[PDB]
Amino acid sequence: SDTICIGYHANNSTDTVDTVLEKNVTVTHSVNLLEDSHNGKLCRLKGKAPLQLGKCNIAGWILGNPECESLLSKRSWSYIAETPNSENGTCYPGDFADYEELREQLSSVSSFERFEIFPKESSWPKHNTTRGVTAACSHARKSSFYKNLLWLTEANGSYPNLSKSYVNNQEKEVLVLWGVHHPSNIEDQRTLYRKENAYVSVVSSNYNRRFTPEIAERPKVRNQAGRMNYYWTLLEPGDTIIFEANGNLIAPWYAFALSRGLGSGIITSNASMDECDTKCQTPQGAINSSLPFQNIHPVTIGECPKYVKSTKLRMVTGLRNGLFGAIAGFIEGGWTGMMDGWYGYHHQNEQGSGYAADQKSTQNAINGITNKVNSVIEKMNTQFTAVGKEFNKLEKRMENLNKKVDDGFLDIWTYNAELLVLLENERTLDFHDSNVKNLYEKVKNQLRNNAKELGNGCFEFYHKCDNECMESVKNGTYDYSEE
Amino acid sequence: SDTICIGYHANNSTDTVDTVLEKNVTVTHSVNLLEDSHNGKLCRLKGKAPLQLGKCNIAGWILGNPECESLLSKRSWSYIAETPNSENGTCYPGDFADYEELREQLSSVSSFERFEIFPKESSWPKHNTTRGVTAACSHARKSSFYKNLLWLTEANGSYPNLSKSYVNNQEKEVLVLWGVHHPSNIEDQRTLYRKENAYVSVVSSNYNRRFTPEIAERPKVRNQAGRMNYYWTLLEPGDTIIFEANGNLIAPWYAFALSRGLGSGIITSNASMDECDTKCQTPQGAINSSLPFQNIHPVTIGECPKYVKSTKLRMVTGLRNIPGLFGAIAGFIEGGWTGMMDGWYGYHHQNEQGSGYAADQKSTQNAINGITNKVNSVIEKMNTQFTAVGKEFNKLEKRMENLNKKVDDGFLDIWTYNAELLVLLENERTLDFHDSNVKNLYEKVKNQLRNNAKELGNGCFEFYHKCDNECMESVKNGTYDYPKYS
Amino acid sequence: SDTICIGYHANNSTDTVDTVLEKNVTVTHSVNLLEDSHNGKLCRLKGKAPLQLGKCNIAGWILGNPECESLLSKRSWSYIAETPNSENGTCYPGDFADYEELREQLSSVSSFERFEIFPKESSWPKHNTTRGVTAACSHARKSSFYKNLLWLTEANGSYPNLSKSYVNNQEKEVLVLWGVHHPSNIEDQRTLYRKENAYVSVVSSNYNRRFTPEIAERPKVRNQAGRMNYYWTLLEPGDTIIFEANGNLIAPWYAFALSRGLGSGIITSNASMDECDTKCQTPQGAINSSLPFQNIHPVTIGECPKYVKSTKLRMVTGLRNIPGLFGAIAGFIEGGWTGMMDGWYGYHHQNEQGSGYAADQKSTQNAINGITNKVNSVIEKMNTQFTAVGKEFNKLEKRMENLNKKVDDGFLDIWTYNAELLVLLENERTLDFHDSNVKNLYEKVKNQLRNNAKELGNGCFEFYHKCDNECMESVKNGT
Ligand SMILES: *[C@@H]1O[C@H](CO)[C@@H](O[C@@H]2O[C@H](CO)[C@@H](O[C@@H]3O[C@H](CO[C@H]4O[C@H](CO)[C@@H](O)[C@H](O[C@H]5O[C@H](CO)[C@@H](O)[C@H](O)[C@@H]5O)[C@@H]4O)[C@@H](O)[C@H](O[C@H]4O[C@H](CO)[C@@H](O)[C@H](O)[C@@H]4O)[C@@H]3O)[C@H](O)[C@H]2NC(C)=O)[C@H](O)[C@H]1NC(C)=O
Ligand SMILES: *[C@@H]1O[C@H](CO)[C@@H](O[C@@H]2O[C@H](CO)[C@@H](O[C@@H]3O[C@H](CO[C@H]4O[C@H](CO)[C@@H](O)[C@H](O)[C@@H]4O)[C@@H](O)[C@H](O[C@H]4O[C@H](CO)[C@@H](O)[C@H](O)[C@@H]4O)[C@@H]3O)[C@H](O)[C@H]2NC(C)=O)[C@H](O)[C@H]1NC(C)=O
Ligand SMILES: *[C@@H]1O[C@H](CO)[C@@H](O[C@@H]2O[C@H](CO)[C@@H](O[C@@H]3O[C@H](CO)[C@@H](O)[C@H](O)[C@@H]3O)[C@H](O)[C@H]2NC(C)=O)[C@H](O)[C@H]1NC(C)=O
Ligand SMILES: *[C@@H]1O[C@H](CO)[C@@H](O[C@@H]2O[C@H](CO)[C@@H](O)[C@H](O)[C@H]2NC(C)=O)[C@H](O)[C@H]1NC(C)=O
Ligand SMILES: *[C@@H]1O[C@H](CO)[C@@H](O[C@@H]2O[C@H](CO)[C@@H](O)[C@H](O)[C@H]2NC(C)=O)[C@H](O)[C@H]1NC(C)=O
Ligand SMILES: *[C@@H]1O[C@H](CO)[C@@H](O[C@@H]2O[C@H](CO)[C@@H](O)[C@H](O)[C@H]2NC(C)=O)[C@H](O)[C@H]1NC(C)=O
Ligand SMILES: *[C@@H]1O[C@H](CO)[C@@H](O[C@@H]2O[C@H](CO)[C@@H](O)[C@H](O)[C@H]2NC(C)=O)[C@H](O)[C@H]1NC(C)=O
Ligand SMILES: *[C@@H]1O[C@H](CO)[C@@H](O)[C@H](O)[C@H]1NC(C)=O
Ligand SMILES: *[C@@H]1O[C@H](CO)[C@@H](O)[C@H](O)[C@H]1NC(C)=O
Ligand SMILES: *[C@@H]1O[C@H](CO)[C@@H](O)[C@H](O)[C@H]1NC(C)=O
Ligand SMILES: *[C@@H]1O[C@H](CO)[C@@H](O)[C@H](O)[C@H]1NC(C)=O
Ligand SMILES: *[C@@H]1O[C@H](CO)[C@@H](O)[C@H](O)[C@H]1NC(C)=O
Ligand SMILES: *[C@@H]1O[C@H](CO)[C@@H](O)[C@H](O)[C@H]1NC(C)=O
Ligand SMILES: *[C@@H]1O[C@H](CO)[C@@H](O)[C@H](O)[C@H]1NC(C)=O
Ligand SMILES: *[C@@H]1O[C@H](CO)[C@@H](O)[C@H](O)[C@H]1NC(C)=O
Ligand SMILES: *[C@@H]1O[C@H](CO)[C@@H](O)[C@H](O)[C@H]1NC(C)=O
Ligand SMILES: *[C@@H]1O[C@H](CO)[C@@H](O)[C@H](O)[C@H]1NC(C)=O
């Protein structure tokens, strides 16, 4: 007897997917949508390396703590990496005004340039510029001080009025930092500033603040009962800043001209830097930006996949290894032997035997599933952003609001991703079930009376069929010689 | 021989939709789910017109900058519209305390009424009330000052202690604003206030602050080295506010009795206002709220379609236009019928009495009702809370500004993804549905005409027996007398 | 002649669901996905009862308003419940610094220990410790004061310098509260403090502030033109706090050692407490947390279903009830069988030995298992973290308040839309599924009886050969 069979692919694949109706379905071909690995390194974003702070936090780096590396020239960075629990910040204890705010300002800086705003050798001719050192800020076992500030003191029994101004002719924003010293007793205030009641005044076109030292005994920090409060402001292009004091000023020595870029952010990381590039950086390492979802870390920088709590997001592209009754229905098994398509034919006649795929229906199915995967992947809108937000000890409400935002996006993206994969995996299998059922009915319609339907997807020809009648039948031309 | 064919509609439509399996599919009918047009005007929200500030920002308007129009009547507004050239604010340089907070609080009011809190002519018998004008607040080429504040100065060589109180009897909140002058040198401090050390004190039942002038040389803004700081508080009904100073006070002259309503916001727009109503205002113009999505602007006020980055959201309602999951459409019935123009699905008959198309009304009306219900569900399930998306943050609120941007951008990402895929997937489902309606019509006829006709394999049945117009009507209305012909 | 029929289940159910194509479809079985009821009481979260403040707000409780002495002995809680009449707070008028911030801090406290930081009887030997009472803080018709603070005044014509330190040896954070008095006139300043210009100083390793009294005429609140501003700080373990003053200090008397727990929150509720447990508390009452969605209240504490504006989220699990896409149900098999009560799909046989219905167990069991897996996926994929939705903002934080409102409202719109459409679309898919299982059941037998029977067109086959009960069982068993 002669036979033409319609059937589908099977292979040695062990891939499993989940579907809305069935868990743990072994499938022939599949695509993973979930980034779940990282390279364990810090990499370049947008071509530039990050600003690496090493032993310091931003306070110590921006103030110039003697244990931190100085930036002498103009530099650029993609994001900032500080390590956890950096211990070199404000070596002299005090309050850093709007510290988190300043950290956020430095996260959106494309270029950054240190310059000597009030040069130490020439700006203070009637004050002592070389005695302002302390053991709290020592380096290599010798006392020192912040490299960007200058602790002025009395000279020859007097601390005269000082008035120092600076005009921003840099055609960009200038970040100016300064300090105010608060002694632990009036003896030290008298010794250093030759006055009991001093003041500091700092003004620009849009900044204006007056400081008066407050003297009291305090618990010792870094063996210091005194305090220095740190302050900063952004001087607009063309604007001037005026410093006026008769005591206690920790004066600007170096300041920073800066250029703004894309908003970036700060990564806390114990990971080391490497000679890699990336479109998306996480605290434990860089991740590929090709898939729509990732489960490595919710706080990322770059053009990043959405963070999900999922551990598996596997999308079926092939077949069971149903809704339309053929696959796992009346055609109960796949053909490992057919290795050139998803759907096709098996012939058995006197002229020879073997499997062959139907190129038309397989190519249509391959092209459609490809469009489906590309839509799940490429419809994902991806802007360059920095997720992280920093809040101080009196911003717990803002911190919890930020956590409620990140967590809600996580719940929405996790649920929708899980269910999308479950439902569309079901749809993809029905699509294959319907492509083979339509292939069967196409041949049945052509083979109207010339064959018996065996009920297994196979038709036994009455008309004697060689290897020549079939090529016309699989090419869909038939002339409906009874044995 | 006589023949009855099953087929589906085709027309001259050029609409294209995308589906999960195929992009750019030509279809007979489709619906747009994406608002992509606005009317270019500012409209009334919740029945009320916005406050239009024109040349002024809220600061200049509320202080009474001499270049701003004063409000003589009691009025109401749903939101505030300032223009990109709103440049007239604090004409005398200084800090406006909690400015953004005041902008948000003033953005929608049930009633608003300016009134003379401390009449200039009668409240300060021992101070100079006529010398406090400056070129920084010039008007008509003459020095001037804010119309709602009064710059008190010394009179006859003395600036006496002042203590002025006001009881809120307005049975609503009163917005009281005031200022503090900070001279640029001690000579000016002496000349105007006859003291080097002055203070200002302002107290209510829940507001309590003391100000002392700080004198220093400062860079000149609008040719002023001095500074004036502006302050405000909302005095609750029945409460008292007390001003105490011996110098430097920029005193309240007019205040505002107001009732605030549900929180609104500020629109920055160069669009003109019109006598239109809307549920959703956008900076470039009002938009309809009938569709679930819009791509006009992310920052809107009202009950608004969700903002998406999509450029096209077209939902198929009809069929592939050919002038498949179930094998019929674009399968064995490979083409549509331009000739059938009164339904989606139907028949072509040819017998000795004539030929022509006819739509199957039952199955067509069923499909129209389902697709209608499907489109209405996609549209009407969209809950949109009244919201004012915009948020203003000052130079020290950058983290807050980025948190607000992360919220708007996260919602944009969720809604764009969900909108695109919903249309991609439901477009596929709608086409499967039409394909399955044609299969069931074809199979319905095949069951009726069991052996009395040959299946040609293209949607057509070749009758063995002669079939007239009562027989053809019998097949199309599903009362085919099968035994009669066997 | 002998007949075998394929059909589907029908019952007396009146449940209705909506589908994307058709509203209000009567179905045989369904599951509710929407929690829409609550028990009307306050319950224990994570095993611990809430702190009920009753007549007091948090200011009155933490400061020790004399009308809150019944709250001085509560030490552990899961969340805080204030009532709509919580009116006893700062009985002496003034500003409470970072009050909302402190309310959020106390929302995340596991254990709480009040302790006498500066004992009134022994810490102030040269000041008057018994005169600092006022009618603004009355108790039992006698002037009084906060039970956790001490209003120090001059003794015998002088208010001497004071310096008091405290070392946190509690091995946990110590919440320290204090105040600064601001009289309305300089006569009262001299009377209480023997000084016109005083100062207060409070310092630790990370806190540093100096306060100066401001003397001015003020409107009277609770008959007081004076003011007391309230302050606090969290003292780190091992750190020292130093109080220094020569006047106007309202000194700490008791402080609080606290241990943080899971971040929780504050509920305002008129509901009474009961001896119940819940994984989710709402202001009107506790709710079940089993379903993925609830419509009771958007501001919840616990592991909570997502809040939706929906009034009905019913998912069909069974079939159209007749007491489609694949053409059988409501197609050529126009009705369901109330008689078949042992399955969703099955057969009716009629031959010379008898008649009756029989469910096809394989196809029914396969369908029941698949629909079960689907219902469980919709439910169990819902990630539910312990959260406290609520956020409190003061009169100068409207922008923050409206940003929090935009966040809550955005999540509500996303979840409502997605829930409604998921149910409409999966209800359609579920009904399509049943239509397809009966079509495949019909087609299986039609292939089996290729020439031996006439297809009647209603799901029934008229046997040509006489078919007995072993022939019938083989057709129903596919043998
Ligand atoms: C309650 O709290 C108040 C605070 O509000 C206390 O008031 C303060 O008390 C302290 C001590 O009681 C006062 O400090 C003293 O100041 C005098 C005045 O010194 C000045 O006057 C002289 C010239 O006019 C000169 O002697 C001084 O020179 C000092 O400073 C320079 C700095 O370079 C240095 O070179 C010198 O060597 C001197 O150090 C200065 O110009 C000062 O003379 C006192 O010295 C005494 O104390 C120190 C330390 O104890 C000791 O070393 C000396 O031997 C000497 O015995 C001292 O420093 C402060 O001025 C007060 N402040 C106010 C506002 O009144 C009050 O005392 C507290 N009461 C109680 C009961 O505790
Ligand atoms: C370091 O910093 C301190 C504080 O910042 C400065 O101290 C101030 O210095 C100014 C300038 O000398 C002082 O102002 C002066 O006040 C004198 C007194 O004026 C009052 O009394 C007279 C007569 O009773 C009245 O006519 C007058 O209207 C006032 O009521 C004035 O007479 C001075 O004017 C002289 O200088 C100006 C220019 O500056 C001329 O135009 C005049 O013609 C006149 O010759 C002057 O205005 C001020 O009092 C000081 N403050 C304090 C708190 O003492 C230091 O000067 C500064 N530098 C140094 C080196 O210490
Ligand atoms: C920069 O960072 C380093 C590392 O954190 C700092 O060195 C550390 O300084 C702390 C504080 O002084 C030391 O702790 C103290 O040790 C001393 C002596 O043992 C003791 O008296 C204190 O009670 C406390 O235990 C710590 O041991 C020390 N560690 C090392 C490795 O040196 C340094 O101070 C920082 N310098 C600047 C300028 O920021
Ligand atoms: C600033 O103060 C320092 C220390 O008080 C002065 O340093 C002294 O300088 C002389 C030379 O002029 C040396 O002989 C001393 O040994 C230095 N003392 C110390 C402790 O190093 C310094 O001179 C002062 N600055 C100016 C400009 O006079
Ligand atoms: C109101 O706004 C106008 C325009 O912003 C101001 O006029 C400008 O004033 C500056 C002086 O600082 C000049 O440099 C410009 O040439 C002016 N522009 C025009 C078009 O005249 C005006 O001063 C503002 N007035 C007040 C009271 O705020
Ligand atoms: C005007 O009011 C002030 C304050 O009420 C009176 O007293 C002065 O107050 C300031 C504080 O702002 C102190 O620095 C002064 O020392 C006070 N003057 C004294 C004590 O004589 C002032 O007396 C009042 N003016 C008149 C004319 O009564
Ligand atoms: C505790 O709260 C009550 C009510 O909120 C406070 O005031 C009572 O209010 C009404 C009159 O307005 C009456 O019940 C009593 O006359 C009021 N009581 C008193 C003592 O005035 C009460 O003052 C609050 N107590 C404290 C210490 O804050
Ligand atoms: C999933 O299927 C694989 C075979 O494909 C099997 O080895 C494994 O145990 C299954 N896991 C289950 C049923 O949980
Ligand atoms: C103070 O005297 C020293 C003496 O060595 C001198 O070097 C310094 O320049 C003087 N300070 C001045 C002139 O401001
Ligand atoms: C889309 O379809 C239209 C109409 O058939 C056709 O003209 C156009 O070339 C197609 N291509 C794209 C990219 O839209
Ligand atoms: C808004 O809808 C109305 C009613 O359908 C319509 O007349 C109007 O043109 C629409 N406007 C815009 C801008 O779409
Ligand atoms: C100052 O004195 C003149 C003449 O006595 C008088 O006209 C004027 O009103 C006085 N100033 C004030 C504020 O009354
Ligand atoms: C107020 O000041 C002006 C100067 O601008 C002066 O001419 C006038 O007389 C003064 N009036 C009083 C009452 O002092
Ligand atoms: C069906 O068509 C026949 C032929 O004209 C007609 O006589 C009969 O009334 C129709 N039955 C219906 C519409 O139910
Ligand atoms: C829905 O259908 C039922 C019949 O099962 C009917 O009683 C009811 O009135 C219909 N409408 C609503 C809103 O329930
Ligand atoms: C404190 O003051 C009260 C009343 O003012 C008085 O009865 C008491 O004896 C005083 N005690 C001391 C120690 O001064
Ligand atoms: C101080 O006040 C107490 C309060 O009772 C009093 O007994 C004593 O006599 C007063 N005088 C002195 C010097 O202690």
Numbering used by the authors:
A (entry chain A): 2 to 322, 330 to 488, 492 to 494
B (entry chain B): 2 to 324, 330 to 492
C (entry chain C): 2 to 324, 330 to 485
Sentences from the paper on this structure:
Hemagglutinin (HA) is an IVA surface protein that allows the virus to attach to host cell receptors and enter the cell. HA is a homotrimeric glycoprotein, with each monomer composed of two regions: (1) the head, comprising the receptor binding domain (RBD) which is crucial in viral attachment, and (2) the stalk, that is responsible for viral and cell membrane fusion in the endosome. Mammalian IVA infection is initiated through HAs binding to α2,6 sialic acid-linkage galactose receptors on the host cell surface, before entering the cell via endocytosis. Following endocytosis, HAs undergo conformational rearrangements due to the low pH of the endosome, leading to membrane fusion.
The full length mature HA1/HA2 trimer crystal structures are as follows: (1) A/Fort Monmouth/1/1947 solved at 2.95 Å resolution, (2) A/Jiangsu/ALS1/2011 solved at 2.35 Å resolution, (3) A/Almaty/32/1998 solved at 2.05 Å resolution, (4) A/Hickox/JY2/1940 solved at 1.95 Å resolution, (5) A/Netherlands/002P1/1951 solved at 2.5 Å resolution, and (6) A/Melbourne/1/1946 solved at 2.55 Å resolution. The antibody C05 Fab failed to bind many of our other IVA HAs, as examined by analytical size exclusion chromatography. Failure to bind correlated with an insertion in HA between 146R-G147 of the epitope, whereas sequences without an insertion bound the antibody. Although the insertion of either a glycosylated residue observed in the electron density of our structures (A/Netherlands/002P1/1951 and A/Fort Monmouth/1/1947) or of a bulky side chain which partially changes the loop conformation (A/Jiangsu/ALSI/2011, A/Almaty/32/1998, A/Hickox/JY2/1940, and A/Melbourne/1/1946) appears consistent with the loss of C05 antibody Fab binding by analytical SEC, rigorous mutational analysis and quantitative binding experiments would be required to prove these are evasion mechanisms. It is possible, for example, that the glycosylation could be accommodated by movement of the positioning of the antibody as was the case for the S245N glycosylation site of H3N2 viral neuraminidases with IG01 antibodies (Ref PubMed ID 36543789).
